[PDB]
Amino acid sequence: XXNXXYX
Numbered sequence: 038x039x040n041x042x043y044x
């Protein structure tokens with residue numbers, strides 16, 4: 038799960 042980036 039979670040997410041992140043940076044785009």
Ligand SMILES: *[C@@H]1O[C@H](CO)[C@@H](O)[C@H](O)[C@H]1O[C@H]1C[C@](C)(N)[C@H](O)[C@H](C)O1
Nearest residue numbers: 038039040041042043044
């Ligand atoms: C993004 O995740 C890293 C790893 O857990 C943390 O060290 C970091 O503090 C975190 O960044 C925060 C601050 C930011 C970039 N303004 C965003 O709100 C993110 C989602 O959370």
